[PDB]
Amino acid sequence: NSEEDKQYLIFIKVFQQAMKGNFAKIYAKTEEGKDPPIKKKVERLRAELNYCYDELSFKEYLSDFLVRGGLNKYFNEHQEEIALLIKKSPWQEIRIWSLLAIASYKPKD
Amino acid sequence: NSEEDKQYLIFIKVFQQAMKGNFAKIYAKTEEGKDPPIKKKVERLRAELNYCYDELSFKEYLSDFLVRGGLNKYFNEHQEEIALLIKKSPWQEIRIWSLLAIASYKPKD
Amino acid sequence: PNYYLYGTVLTRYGLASLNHDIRRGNKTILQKGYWNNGKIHSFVGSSAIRWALRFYLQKQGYLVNRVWDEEEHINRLTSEDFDPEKFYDDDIFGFALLPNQRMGALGMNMAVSLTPYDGAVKLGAKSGREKDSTSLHFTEYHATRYQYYFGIDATHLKDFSRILPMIDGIMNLPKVGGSSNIFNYPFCPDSLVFQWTNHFASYISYCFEYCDPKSKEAKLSQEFIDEVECGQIDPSKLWIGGTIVKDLQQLDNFESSPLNKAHIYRNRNEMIEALKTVIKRDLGL
Amino acid sequence: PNYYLYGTVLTRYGLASLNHDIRRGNKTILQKGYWNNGKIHSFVGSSAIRWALRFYLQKQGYLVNRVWDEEEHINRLTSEDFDPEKFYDDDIFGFALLPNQRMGALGMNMAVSLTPYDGAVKLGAKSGREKDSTSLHFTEYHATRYQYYFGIDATHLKDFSRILPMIDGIMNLPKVGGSSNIFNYPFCPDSLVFQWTNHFASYISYCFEYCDPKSKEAKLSQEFIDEVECGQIDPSKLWIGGTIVKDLQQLDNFESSPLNKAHIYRNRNEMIEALKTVIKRDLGL
Amino acid sequence: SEEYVDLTFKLRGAPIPLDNGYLTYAALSRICPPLHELKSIGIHPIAGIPTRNNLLELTAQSRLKIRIYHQQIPLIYPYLAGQAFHIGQNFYQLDIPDYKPLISSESVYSRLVIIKGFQDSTNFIEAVQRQMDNLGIQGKIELLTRQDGTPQRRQLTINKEGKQFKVRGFGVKISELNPEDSLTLQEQGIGGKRKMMCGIFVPATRSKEEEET
Amino acid sequence: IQGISELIALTPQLGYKPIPIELTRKLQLILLVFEQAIGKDVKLLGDLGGIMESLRIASTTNQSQPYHLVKLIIPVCEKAKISVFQLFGSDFKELGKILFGNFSLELKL
Structure with missing residues (x-):
């Protein structure tokens, strides 16, 4: 119902899977008994997400973060819908959705 | 609908097909049980996309990437639209579309 | 009486990477933003100059x-x-x-880059082989001459004599926070436009202008010259010194212009000495 | 006393393929950017010289x-x-x-090429295992003289005597880059402009300039000559030498000019010895 | 200095006669047409360990070195990069070329110089002095001597057509040049037969190398 | 017909037996000029992709292998706007300069 909301939910899932990929990357990078920075990484992500000055800024960051996430199936299923959602829509609402995803990935683990 | 978004989607498909060709090339290059470098190749592609200083830089890069991709059927059917879209539009927007495309290739295989 | 010294100062031409924003993934992004005529100019933080x-x-x-x-x-x-x-x-x-x-x-x-900023990101390597996460790094640089604006409330000073060391420092400004190991940018002024007056109304803001993009001309804005000629910005209160003096003197009918009645010195130290003498007179030092 | 040694040193004319960039598709492009008058100039990274x-x-x-x-x-x-x-x-x-x-x-x-980079791509064939195959690729080369700027915070050194080897190293700089220096391009300077002063303000950043790519005389910028003549850059603090001194001494009014009283030597080693004597006097070595 | 380049090729193959000037020149012209018309080009002698029968055995340091203006390399690089040639019935192979600079040295040397119509040592010294002045060069002229001290002559056998002509020359050592004039000498040279593998000048250590044996 | 006529008329004027790798490296130089032109202008890829692939294949196969005259060389010099006479007769300097001028490149060999 209200396919725009469906696209919004699948975008939330896409961002969650991308952050999962980046978490796997940082967990692979850390070595020895050092505590893998996850809280630090999450706070850094939130701080960089808040820091943005329209259009090019934070959209370049969104795309770069999604690429850093790597293989993401939810984005694989739906190409045109998410591509149009990212190209369209005011960037602030995309920021809202991404921050909600930040808080909604924790269900996964 | 919304013909400019049609051009954006066919650009996404063209980039995906070109990177499919590049992936096929590098798979052909490697031999024996070593894992072919693809996640590393994706990281290199992202880093080279990020590195650019407007106009000529990243435009020679996109043209060279499309060339090294091989023969692009979508580009073949859509020469004029793709060329006009590339010549116009801010290069940062094209980089954002290319990064999306990057994150978008996976459903191909 | 309240006294105010306002000054627009232009640095020397060179390669600079003074201020960096966020370090996206590998570039140290030069602090850039929109400016006059709507093209991106690099910036140098006023806090760095302080x-x-x-x-x-x-x-x-x-x-x-x-x-x-x-x-x-x-x-x-x-x-x-x-x-x-x-x-x-x-x-x-x-x-x-x-x-x-x-x-x-x-x-x-904040210091704006006279020259618009297009590209020019630097490469970086670290020896050979055994490459780790710190092996590859990019760095942005701009070939321009930065220009910033400052004003000081001399009466607000607890000790009035402290104004002279400040001007001396503005002349011999040390390194401004930036990658001086690979980008040594001297921030010493090469052109000055100072105004020592008793009014709050401070014009003489960013006036140095670039004749040709991607060049190092640094002529003086037409609006500032028109303001000086029209009657405002009293030439007796105007203090000009630096490389711009030669360009001003090569202007036609400069003698007839009210600019010629302003205190101009081609040498910077002579103008600084004259300004400090005037300030010491007006502050009873 | 906070002592500083700034200087712009100029190299000899020759071919340069030193600090190639990302090599877009086949050409090892030479690191180029924008410089005076908005013409493309080739650069050499300062980290390579370090x-x-x-x-x-x-x-x-x-x-x-x-x-x-x-x-x-x-x-x-x-x-x-x-x-x-x-x-x-x-x-x-x-x-x-x-x-x-x-x-x-x-x-x-970074070292900036004296003349703008116009053309001069070179044919380079790399080998291939494909039944002894040779694929042709491109490589940019530039015929110019590189000048660069450097500053030494002598007081910052933990051991004050360590300044002396640094000047020798600048004079006897080894091959820059190494493997990718296709044509062996020496970086031993052929003309020096040294200012050993005690204040942070530093001109002479890029005094060397000739332009006119048809020749390789490597003249001195009119701006530096004017700055010397005006009264800034105290001649007793100025050390000049190299092939540029041969050109300078032929100039008319050179004896009357304030450039004469600046420490000037035709031979570079005479500069090095006299300046090192001055440093050892000032630093109590 | 760097305004002229010495093109070096890692050369391998059969052993070669020690008077192989025209042989290698003709082979190179056979595999490189533009070499036959260039002007400011010259070839360095090919190093190695000689044999008892006036032949040279090529070693790892043996290499074909060509002196050329940097504005004419693209006319020669295509026909020599990786290319192979035949001298008579012998096969020779060249690798990917490398570039070497023209460095100045206090003293210079030439293995073989020939000027037309000069066979005696004294008039040869006079003619080398004349060409020496023509180039605006300052130095002193000496002739490399054998173990006997006799000035050493070297001979070039040009096997043009059925016949073959004899041209005899001397080894010339010139010292006290000053580096600028030294570079001018190495780039110009004396003798003219630089395509004929004679007139290239080299730092003075190779003079000692040739004087020992 | 004009290309074949030039090919016949040029052979007696060369004065030597042609060297195979001379022709191979002239073809490679034309390929590099094509690649630089594509880097400058993306649209030219649509006009030159097939010939680019053919030239790349001809430069990857054994150089001693002959090239199909009408299938490869004549169309290649045609798209390069170069006569067969110019291709087989001029030296590398003249050929490179004329190619750069033809595609308005700034290179100088």
Whole structure:
């Protein structure tokens, strides 16, 4: 119902899977008994997400973060819908959705 | 609908097909049980996309990437639209579309 | 009487990477933003220039509350409680505790890059082989001459004599915070437009202009010259010194122009000495 | 006394393929950017010159943390902890572990080609295992003289005597880059402009300039000559020498000009000896 | 200095006569047409360990070195990069070329110089002095001597058509040049037969190498 | 017909037996000029992709292998706007200069 909301939910899932990929990357990078920075990484992500000055800024960051996430199936299923959602829509609402995803990935683990 | 978004989607498909060709090339290059470098190749592609200083830089890069991709059927059917879209539009927007495309290739295989 | 010294100052041409924003993934992004005519110009933080002036005051003797260690890279306070009466640093720049909180005698504007900023990102490698996460790094640089605007409330100074060391530091400005190891950018002025007057109305803002994009001409804005000619900005209160003096003197009918009645010196030190003499006269030093 | 040694040194004319960039598809493009008059000029990274100086220091004794293997192309740390008190390299160029994070005495700027980079691509065929195949690729080369700017915070050195080897290394700079320096391009300077002063303000950043690519005379910029003549750049603090002195001495009014009283020598080694005597006098060596 | 380049090729193959000037020149012209018309080009002698029968055995340091202006390399690089040629019935192969600079040295040397109509040592010294002045060069002229001290002559056998002509020359050592004039000498040379593998000048250590044996 | 006529008329004027790798490296130089032109202008890829692939294949196969005259060389010099006479007769300097001028490149060999 209200396919725009469906696209919004699948975008939330896409961002969650991308952050999962980046978490796997940082967990692979850390070595020895050092505590893998996850809280630090999450706070850094939130701080960089808040820091943005329209259009090019934070959209370049969104795309770069999604690429850093790597293989993401939810984005694989739906190409045109998410591509149009990212190209369209005011960037602030995309920021809202991404921050909600930040808080909604924790269900996964 | 919304013909400019049609051009954006066919650009996404063209980039995906070109990177499919590049992936096929590098798979052909490697031999024996070593894992072919693809996640590393994706990281290199992202880093080279990020590195650019407007106009000529990243435009020679996109043209060279499309060339090294091989023969692009979508580009073949859509020469004029793709060329006009590339010549116009801010290069940062094209980089954002290319990064999306990057994150978008996976459903191909 | 209240006295104010306003000045637009232009640095020397060179390659600079002074200020960096966020370090996206590998580039140290030069602090850039939109400016006149709607093209991206690089910027140099006024806080960096204030730090440079404070470091100058530290180096040439003087008393400063904040001491730059230069070895621990840490800032130390001589006294936890600030005192503008004694220390030059607290009197000139102010202080916030979160007492007195002062106001700060020196007020400065952010430094804009005369030349528009297009590209020019630097490569970086580290020896060969055994490459780790720190092996590859890019760095942005701009070939331009930065220009910033400052104004000081001399009456606000706790000690009126402290104005002279500030001007001396503005002349011999130390390194401005940036990648000086690979981009050594001298921030010493090469052209000055100073105004020593008793009014709050401060024009003489960013006036130095670039004749040709991607070049190092640095002629003077037509609006500023028109303002000087029209009657405002009294030439007797105008203090011009630097490389722009030659260009001004090669202008046609310069003698008839009111600009010729302004205090112009091709040498910077001569104009600085004359300005300091006038200031000492007007402050009873 | 806070003493500083700034200088712009100029190299000899020749072919340069030194600091190639990302090599877009087939051409090892030469690192180029925008410079005076908005014409493309080729650059050499300052980090390459710093590495060359470090290699020179490691060659002739001068205990250094980073040893260049010259065979396996791997830098090895003599000691894990950086100790600028004992090592020349840590004292001079600084370090960053990410301890002490030394600021580093020497500051450098990238070398800018005297003449604009116009054309001059070269044919380079790389080999191939495909049944002895040779695929042709391109390589940019430039015929010019590179000038660069550097500054030495002599007071910042942990050992004040370490300045003396640095000038020698600048005079006897080894091959820059190494393998990718296709044509062996020397970086030993052929004309020097040294200012040994005691204040932070520093002109003469890029005094050398000729333009006119048809020749390679490497004249001096009119701006530097004017700045010397005006009264700034105290002649007693100015050290000039090289082939440029031969051109300068032929100039008319040279005896009457304030450029004459500046320390000037046709031979570069005479400069080096006299200046080193001055430094050892001023630093109590 | 760097305004002229010495093109070096790692040369391998059969052993070669020690008077192989015209042989290698003709082979190179056979595999490189533009070499036959260039002007400011010259070829360095091919190093190695000689044999008892006046032949040279090529070693790892044996290499074909060509002196050329940097504005004419693209006319020669295509026909020699990786290319192979035949001298008579012998096969010779060249690798990917490398570039070497023209460095100045206090003293210079030439293995073989020939000027037309000069066979005696004294008039040869006079003619080398005349060409020496024509180039605006300053130095002193000496002739490399055999173990006997007799000035050493070297002979070039040009096997043009059925016949073959004899041209005899001397080894010339010139010292006290000053580096600028030294570079001018190495780039110009004396003798003219630089395509004929004679007139290239080299730092003075190779003079000692040739004087020992 | 004009290309074949030039090919016949040019052979007696060469004065030597042609060297195979001379022709191979002239073809490679034309390929590099094509690649630089594509880097400058993306649209030219649509006009030159097939010939680019053919030239790349001809430069990857054994150089001693002959090239199909009418299938490969004549169309290649046609798209390069170069006569067969110019291709087989001029030296590398003249050929490179004329190619750069033809595609308005700034290179100088």
